[PDB]
């Protein structure tokens, strides 16, 4: 996953009860810095870390 | 739904030029959908012959482009691109 990057972000907020965890894309050379949420349906969804709801859910899942 | 389904992490091609990773073409398959990268997104447009010999080190100058309704529109910049494996 060293060259795995998010080309598109989800535009609407994912309901908090539907999330499991997250990770960041690890290449600094990815065009768009991204966080990857993993949902209860075992899906990986790209989200824009410049949005507040993404920041808040990151803190939530961290605890 | 189309947006969420297509907001999947995707493998990009690397390069030795120190610039951003770029998609090979402008389409990616995930979650049961052949997705199109958003207009403006960076891509490589490789010829059929270049794709045939694409490997884990650069062996051809790869045309840089931008995605536009599913086509990688070349902008004239050339890079030494390669696949990660």
UniProtKB/Swiss-Prot annotation, chain A:
Subcellular locations according to the entry: Secreted
Posttranslational modification: O-glycosylated.
MF (Gene Ontology): CCR chemokine receptor binding; CCR1 chemokine receptor binding; CCR2 chemokine receptor binding; chemokine activity; heparin binding
Annotated GO CC locations: extracellular region; extracellular space
Result for mutant: residue 12 to A: Decreases binding to Link domain of TNFAIP6
Entry keyword set: Chemotaxis, Cytokine, Disulfide bond, Glycoprotein, Heparin-binding, Inflammatory response, Pyrrolidone carboxylic acid, Secreted, Signal
Known function: Chemotactic factor that attracts monocytes and eosinophils, but not neutrophils. Augments monocyte anti-tumor activity. Also induces the release of gelatinase B. This protein can bind heparin. Binds to CCR1, CCR2 and CCR3.
Similarity comment: family membership: Belongs to the intercrine beta (chemokine CC) family.
Listed name of the protein: C-C motif chemokine 7
Organism whose genome encodes this protein: Homo sapiens
Portion of the parent chain present: 30 to 92 of 99
Curated annotation (Swiss-Prot), chain B:
Predominant place of localization: secreted
Record keywords: Disulfide bond, Glycoprotein, Secreted, Signal
UniProt feature coiled coil, ranges: none
Glycosylation site list: 14, 17, 31, 45, 59, 75
Keyword presence, Transcription regulation: no
Tree of life domain: Eukaryota
Keyword RNA-binding: no
One annotated Gene Ontology cellular component of this protein: extracellular region
Disulphide linkage map: 8-30, 26-67, 43-72, 62-81
GO BP: negative regulation of chemokine activity
GO MF annotation, one: chemokine binding
Cell compartments where the protein resides: Secreted
Role description: Salivary chemokine-binding protein which has chemokine-neutralizing activity and binds to host chemokines CCL1, CCL3, CCL3L1, CCL4, CCL4L1, CCL5, CCL7, CCL8, CCL13, CCL14, CCL15, CCL16, CCL17, CCL18, CCL19, CCL20, CCL21, CCL22, CCL23, CCL24, CCL27, XCL1, CX3CL1, CXCL1, CXCL2, CXCL4, CXCL5, CXCL6, CXCL7, CXCL9, CXCL12 and CXCL14.
Name this protein carries in UniProt: Evasin P1243
Biological source species: Amblyomma americanum
Residues of the full protein shown: 39 to 123 of 123
